[PDB]
Amino acid sequence: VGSDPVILATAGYDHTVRFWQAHSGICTRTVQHQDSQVNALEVTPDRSMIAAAGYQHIRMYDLNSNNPNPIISYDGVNKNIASVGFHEDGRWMYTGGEDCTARIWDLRSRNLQCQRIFQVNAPINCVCLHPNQAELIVGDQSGAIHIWDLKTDHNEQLIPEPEVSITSAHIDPDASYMAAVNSTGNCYVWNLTGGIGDEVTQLIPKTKIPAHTRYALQCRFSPDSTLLATCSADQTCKIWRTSNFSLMTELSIKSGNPGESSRGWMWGCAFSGDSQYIVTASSDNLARLWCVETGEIKREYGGHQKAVVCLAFNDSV
Amino acid sequence: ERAAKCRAYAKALHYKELEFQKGPTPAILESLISINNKLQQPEAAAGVLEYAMKHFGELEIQATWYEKLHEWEDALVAYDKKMDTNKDDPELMLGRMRCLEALGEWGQLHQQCCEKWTLVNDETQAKMARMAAAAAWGLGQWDSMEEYTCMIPRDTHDGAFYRAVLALHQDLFSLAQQCIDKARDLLDAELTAMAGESYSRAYGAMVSCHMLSELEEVIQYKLVPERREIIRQIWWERLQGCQRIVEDWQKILMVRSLVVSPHEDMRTWLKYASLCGKSGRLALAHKTLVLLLGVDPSRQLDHPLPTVHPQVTYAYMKNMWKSARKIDAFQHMQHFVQTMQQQAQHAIATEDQQHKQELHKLMARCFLKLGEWQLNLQGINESTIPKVLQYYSAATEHDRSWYKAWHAWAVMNFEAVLHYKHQNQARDEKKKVTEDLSKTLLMYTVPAVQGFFRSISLSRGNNLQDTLRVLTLWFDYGHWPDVNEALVEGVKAIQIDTWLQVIPQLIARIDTPRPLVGRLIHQLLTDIGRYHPQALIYPLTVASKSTTTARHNAANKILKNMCEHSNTLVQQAMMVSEELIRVAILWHEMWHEGLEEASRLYFGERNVKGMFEVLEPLHAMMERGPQTLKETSFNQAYGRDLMEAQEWCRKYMKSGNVKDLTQAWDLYYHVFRRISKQLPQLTSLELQYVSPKLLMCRDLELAVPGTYDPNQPIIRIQSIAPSLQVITSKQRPRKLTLMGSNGHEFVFLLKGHEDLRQDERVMQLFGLVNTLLANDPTSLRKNLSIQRYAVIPLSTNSGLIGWVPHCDTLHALIRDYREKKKILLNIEHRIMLRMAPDYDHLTLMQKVEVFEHAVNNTAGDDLAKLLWLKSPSSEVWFDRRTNYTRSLAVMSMVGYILGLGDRHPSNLMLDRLSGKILHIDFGDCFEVAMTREKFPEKIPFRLTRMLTNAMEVTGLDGNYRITCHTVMEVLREHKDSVMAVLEAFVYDPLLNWRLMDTNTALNKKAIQIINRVRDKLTGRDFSHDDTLDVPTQVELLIKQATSHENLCQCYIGWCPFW
Ligand SMILES: Nc1ncnc2c1ncn2[C@@H]1O[C@H](COP(=O)(O)OP(=O)(O)O)[C@@H](O)[C@H]1O
Ligand SMILES: [Mg+2]
Ligand SMILES: [Mg+2]
Structure with missing residues (x-):
């Protein structure tokens, strides 16, 4: 399951977390996740176990013991836990919640308590960690993006256009670019002043992409740092070049007739290691595998009873 | 033939609108502005x-x-x-x-x-x-x-x-x-x-x-x-x-210029210039005035103004104020007034007395602007307070009568008081302090009281604001002699009528701890007893059966006093409200809720001291012996069991066992099963079993609940209809119906466990709002109103409610249409759960999708469509729409100001003959519903989709929005009247219990609630610092009421998709 070279996980309103075999479309194992939908999936950098942030809990199933149930659960946090993020070195977990708090969790200890809390006014939609491991980017529902320095505990904030909520942020492997995506449907890019070690790490506004008319749901950089992916509520995942900031490939589930009323939002996406492919999660019960250059649907992962909102994708050696 | 031409139009407009539905085209859009x-x-x-x-x-x-x-x-x-x-x-x-x-x-x-x-x-x-x-x-x-x-x-x-x-x-x-x-x-x-x-x-x-x-x-x-x-x-x-x-x-x-020149017309053109300002054509009004002056658009700006025509100048100056130049405007007024008293005291050689008085009236109307402008330019502070009071008192002198003048002076004095009371709350946040304050407040309080009094007498009919204001100063000032004398003087002077408006407020303070306050109230109420007994009995009767001792005591003293001149009215009303309470919750219904509550405390809380407190009243209640055939037939089938269930309960009280207590609960669960089975069979009540004294009633002198007013012949309870339908619900209200001494029937809803006093003060607020709209020309032009109904509290538990005829809940009209058209009633509901079984736990983003999914797979007409089939014609159809659209926007705005939550499909209804919408159930007022813990309402008022859709296409742009700022306009102008009323039941002693419910002293909370309302009436309801004008605020609100992000979060019952 986590023993296979590729890990592909899918979760939604149907109370399961299903694991797929990338190259075929056969579903390996399914786990029970009851009482809640799943808001975010993330496989720990250690490839040992996966995190399922849900409603007032973050249950974590095991990718090694290939069978049981939640190794760890984390409770006593009210309202949804929306984003999960990990620190390369095993033992840190970051979360953003509807409870206005960015939280750091010690994975190598006990306590349903968390090592730290960062309080903001207004719910946090996404939490993402700068590659340098020292700064956490936190985007809330008010439209502020807080950069939180995990050392100096010095909080610094930034609002783009916002009176509008920012839906997700991301920062590329090479730490050269930061992206934020909001409910208007705009995608902001910043240039990253590499402070790092006695840190300055400042942000310089480069572009505002008019990505979508409807909600923009998640943005993600390719490992490459070549491309930028924008999933949204217009049943679309748009892939943009980082040199150009132009549209390179569009993926869509737009039915085929104006009187269909849709069926399916583009909830999540994940690039392959080579940045040659992209995985897609949709409310039409299917995860999908796309070829980034042609935009050809190279696979369809069918299994989920109800909708899909979560992806996890992993390539490591 | 004339009313026959519009029918073809109305009908084609229907299909034209039904066409626009299928696809908005400039082809249709053209033919639409035409036919409309x-x-x-x-x-x-x-x-x-x-x-x-x-x-x-x-x-x-x-x-x-x-x-x-x-x-x-x-x-x-x-x-x-x-x-x-x-x-x-x-x-x-x-x-x-x-x-x-x-x-x-x-x-x-x-x-x-x-x-x-x-x-x-x-x-x-x-x-x-x-x-x-x-x-x-x-x-x-x-x-x-x-x-x-x-x-x-x-x-x-x-x-x-x-x-x-x-x-x-x-x-x-x-x-x-x-x-x-x-x-x-x-x-x-x-x-x-x-x-x-x-x-x-x-x-x-x-x-x-x-x-x-x-x-x-x-x-x-x-x-x-x-x-x-x-x-x-x-x-x-x-x-x-x-x-x-x-x-x-x-x-x-x-056309009139062809004959009569402006200089002879004078008044004619000033009235016109007056309209040009009020409408908003100041550049034109100026030119009209310049012409009448025969002097410059004052190109010589530094110079004083021509006093040749006193009226024209006043006009010019007030135009200058409404124009840009308003430190300049104020300045010309100080001088004009000074020139005016000279031109009076000196130029008046007796033989000119008409000129003298009109010169004195213009001056009054000048001073009132002077004080008005001083306050506008400077605000209220230690410097302006005695200056404007100077101006107003000066205006009070030169007109003697004139409501505005006395009114303004009263308010200024009353705000002089508030300025310092609120300044001393400022000081005490961080001995000779109170002494000076005493002399400070007694200084402004007395003239305020006096002012409000001579203002009221000049308002006959429309004086609710000023009447209430008297009561603030009265109640609020634990009485230092000076104040009380002025109050006693006024009560003597002012007409008795005045007080009827204000009776629930007076009664809400019968038991006033302050000694001097109480006396006057009691004396006033007794005089209001001598004349207009009727407007008193019902409310006094309720008060007289109060657990609070001093209330019912003091209440009786007045009733005693009223028997000395109206005995049997007191006697009838006494018994009639007694029997109605008996009918509201019967003996078994009191046990059913009492056995539920008792099993919660015991079999789920380990509470027996509280459980005994639930049962002991129900036992003591029956101990008084059965008094009706229903009370006795209960007493046989259940009585002996319960009488001995207490026997075991009182064996445990002394023994402290647990087997004693288990025999009691063995018996209790037995009778529960018996009653529960009989309860869905409670669909009617015959008066001859339930309350004989009421079947007994014939030709009383007691007026049909909440139908008494002077001006109108008293309609009395002639006969009570022998049967009451039991509306099946969780509280089983009754559909009591009385027969009138006129002949007409009067149907009521006898509710059992709902404190109707809030609903009352609301209906009061509505009354006021209705008057305000009847007095704004445009609002009267468009018939803008709120259908209200009668609210007669009977106790803290119960009360009567006027049954609005021809009405069905929004929920009713749908359920019928849905069943007629073979559509599953809650289909949007079933759709949502099929998609997301844990809907209530999703993130906002996740929720919006699911919500939108449901809307996109259901029909949004229903209401629109059933209202079309309902209509016997199409000009009737069109009018019923124009009615509906307006009446709703009216209640949208007003509801917002009130903070009226909980507007689900069973809490509003439609008149099937006018179309006009009607609100019931005024539980959640002020943000309350939004502030709550579980499922907070984000919405300001219900502007659900099927509501929007039943309007004309181009809905919110058309009749609705326009009606919104018209209504909201009126409100912001008369914001003080609206605030008098609301203040009068937020700071009301008995009614503060609906704000300590933020748990599931109060002085601080009550202050906020009232600020919140002022914000809404001064456009500060959104951003703290921006003072938004009407159309903006309205737009902001319509937006907030429409937002999918707001509606998806609504409790599912509220049917955010209907
Ligand atoms: N003024 C009224 N006119 C007509 N029907 C009414 C009136 N007041 C209440 N009803 C009826 O009683 C039902 C429930 O009353 P309501 O006032 O909503 O109290 P609750 O919310 O406690 O059930 C309504 O659905 C309606 O049919
Ligand atoms: Mg109701
Ligand atoms: Mg209610």
């Missing part, structure tokens, strides 16, 4: 243009848009920009002129006419003449008029008219005579040429037919000299009476 026009619905059509703009910038030129939107002042400056950037363009100039003739801009219209006379176009040359005649007519220049008239064809209504005017100046009366009749027939036949599809030209036909008949009086005003006063009267009276926007009145006066 023939139907003489100006605003609904104006809505169609609003949509036409925001979707099709395609009939183009933003200047052509402002012109069709009758925003001439905007289109002019848009045509300048369109001409200065472009070229000559024969079309752009015609509009540039049409703006000028609408704006009464003859100066520029004549210049633009002559200075541009190449006009190689012949149609451009033909139109040109019509306008340049009126422009020349306004500018005097009669030679220019005839030149341009000799170009206007005599085949046009216009060409025939302008000759009649030229003849009247040149004294050719027979020519003028014939030209009128020929212009009439060229207009009569023109009203058949475009028979239906015309501009405000069908309403401007009134403007031309009005002028033609007026021009026939200007004719009467040339040779035979008798009617000068008779004509000037009809001219003057049919002007205060007439309501025609600025533009028409210009022309209307231009």
Whole structure:
């Protein structure tokens, strides 16, 4: 399951977390996740176990013991836990919640308590960690993006256009670019002043992409740092070049007739290691595998009873 | 045939609208403003243009848009920009002129006419003449008029008219005579040429037919000299009476200008200039005034103003204030007043007494502005307080009567009090302190009281605000002698009527701990007893059966006092409200809720001390012996069991066992099962089993609950109908029905466990709001109101509610339509759960999708569609819509101000005969519903989709939004009256219990609630610092009520998709 070279996980309103075999479309194992939908999936950098942030809990199933149930659960946090993020070195977990708090969790200890809390006014939609491991980017529902320095505990904030909520942020492997995506449907890019070690790490506004008319749901950089992916509520995942900031490939589930009323939002996406492919999660019960250059649907992962909102994708050696 | 023409329109408009539904096209959009026009619905059509703009910038030129939107002042400056950037363009100039003739801009219209006379176009040359005649007519220049008239064809209504005017100046009366009749027939036949599809030209036909008949009086005003006063009267009276926007009145006066010059008219033009300001044409009003002064648009700005015509100056100055220059305006007033008292004290040699008094009345109306402006420029502080009080007292002197003057002085004094009370709360946040405060407050309190009193007596009918204000100072001032004397003086002076408005407020303080306050109240209530007993019994009866000792005690003393002059009325009303309480919750119904509550405390809380407190009243309640056949037939089938269930319960009280207590609960669960089975069988109650004393009643002198008012013959309870339907619900209300001494029937809803006192103060607030809308011209023009109903509290538990006839809940109308059309009632519901089984736990983003999914897979007509099938015709259908649309927007705005939560499909209903909407169930008031823990309402008022959809297409732009700012407009103006009422039940002692419910001293909470309301009435309800104007705030609210992000979060019961 986590023993296979590729890990592909899918979760939604149907109370399961299903694991797929990338190259075929056969579903390996399914786990029970009851009482809640799943808001975010993330496989720990250690490839040992996966995190399922849900409603007032973050249950974590095991990718090694290939069978049981939640190794760890984390409770006593009210309202949804929306984003999960990990620190390369095993033992840190970051979360953003509807409870206005960015939280750091010690994975190598006990306590349903968390090592730290960062309080903001207004719910946090996404939490993402700068590659340098020292700064956490936190985007809330008010439209502020807080950069939180995990050392100096010095909080610094930034609002783009916002009176509008920012839906997700991301920062590329090479730490050269930061992206934020909001409910208007705009995608902001910043240039990253590499402070790092006695840190300055400042942000310089480069572009505002008019990505979508409807909600923009998640943005993600390719490992490459070549491309930028924008999933949204217009049943679309748009892939943009980082040199150009132009549209390179569009993926869509737009039915085929104006009187269909849709069926399916583009909830999540994940690039392959080579940045040659992209995985897609949709409310039409299917995860999908796309070829980034042609935009050809190279696979369809069918299994989920109800909708899909979560992806996890992993390539490591 | 006339009311038969509109039917075809109404019907085609239905299909036309049903067509727009399928696809919005400029083809339909054209034929829509047209048909909504023939139907003489100006605003609904104006809505169609609003949509036409925001979707099709395609009939183009933003200047052509402002012109069709009758925003001439905007289109002019848009045509300048369109001409200065472009070229000559024969079309752009015609509009540039049409703006000028609408704006009464003859100066520029004549210049633009002559200075541009190449006009190689012949149609451009033909139109040109019509306008340049009126422009020349306004500018005097009669030679220019005839030149341009000799170009206007005599085949046009216009060409025939302008000759009649030229003849009247040149004294050719027979020519003028014939030209009128020929212009009439060229207009009569023109009203058949475009028979239906015309501009405000069908309403401007009134403007031309009005002028033609007026021009026939200007004719009467040339040779035979008798009617000068008779004509000037009809001219003057049919002007205060007439309501025609600025533009028409210009022309209307231009006809009168042929005879009576402005300097002789004076009052005529000032009333006109007065309207130009109030409507918003200050640049025009100024010119009107400059003309009357015979002196500069004060080009000599540093100089003092001409005192030659005292009234004109006052006008000029108030125009200057409403204009830009308002430190300048204030300044000219200080001096004008000073010049005015001199021109009085000195210039008045007795033989001038009319001039003296009118000079004294103008001064009063000057001072009132002076104080008004001082407060505006400076605010309230240690410097302005004695200055404005100076101005007002000075205004109080020069008019003696006049409501505004005394009123303003009272309020200023009352706010002088508030300024310092609130300044001392400021100090105490961080001995000789209270002493000076005592002297400070006693200083402003007494005159305030006095002021409010002489203000009230000048308000007869409409004085709720001032009446309430008296009570604030009264109740609020634990009485130091001075205050009390003024209060006693007033009560003596002021009419007894006044107080009826305010009875629930007075009664809410019978048991006032303050000794001097109480006495006056009691004495006042007893006098209100001697006259108008009736407006007292019901409320006093309720008060007299109160657990709070001092209340019911003091309440009785008055009832005793009332038997000395009205005994059997007290006696009847006593018993009638007694029996109604018995009927409301029967013996078994009290046990059913009492056995539930008892099993919660014991079998789920380990509480027996609280459980005994639930049961012991129910046992003691029956101990008094059965008094009705229903109470006895219960007493057999259940009584003995319960009597011995207490036996075991009191074996445990002393033994402290647990097996004693288990026998009791063995018996208790037994009777529970028995009653529970009989409860769905409770669908009716016969009076002869339930309350015989009521079946006994015939021809009482007791008035039918909440039907008493002076002015109107007392309708008394003649007979109570023997059967009450039991509305099956969780509280099983009753549908009691009484028969009236007039003959009519009066149906009520006898509720059992709902404190109706809040609902009452609301219906009161509504009353006030209704008066305010009946007094704003536009609101009266559109019939804007709130259907209210009668609310007669019977205890803290129960009370009666007026049954509004012809009504069904929004929920009812749907359930029937859905079942008729074979649609599953809760289908949106079932859709949501199928998609997301854990819907309630999703993130906002996740929720919105699921919500949108449900909407996209269900019909949004229903309401719209059943209202069409309901209608017996289509002009009935159309009117019922126009009614509905308005009545709803009314309650949207008002509800918001009240903070009226919980507006789900069973809490509002529709009158199936007018269409007008009606609100019931006023539990959640003020943010309350939004503030709550579980499922907080984000919405301000229900503007659900099927509501939006039942309106005209172009809904929110049309009738609704317009009605929204009209209503909201009224509210913000009379914000003090609205706040008097609301303050009067937020700080009300007995009614504060609905705000300590934020748990599932209070002084602080009550303050916020009231600020929150003021914010809403001063446009600070959104951003803290911006003071948003009406249309913005309204737009902001409609947005908030429509947001999918707000509606998806609503508790599912609220049916956010209906
Ligand atoms: N003024 C009224 N006119 C007509 N029917 C009413 C009136 N008041 C209540 N009802 C009826 O009683 C039902 C429940 O009353 P309601 O006032 O909503 O109290 P609750 O919310 O406690 O159930 C409504 O669905 C309606 O049919
Ligand atoms: Mg209700
Ligand atoms: Mg209620």
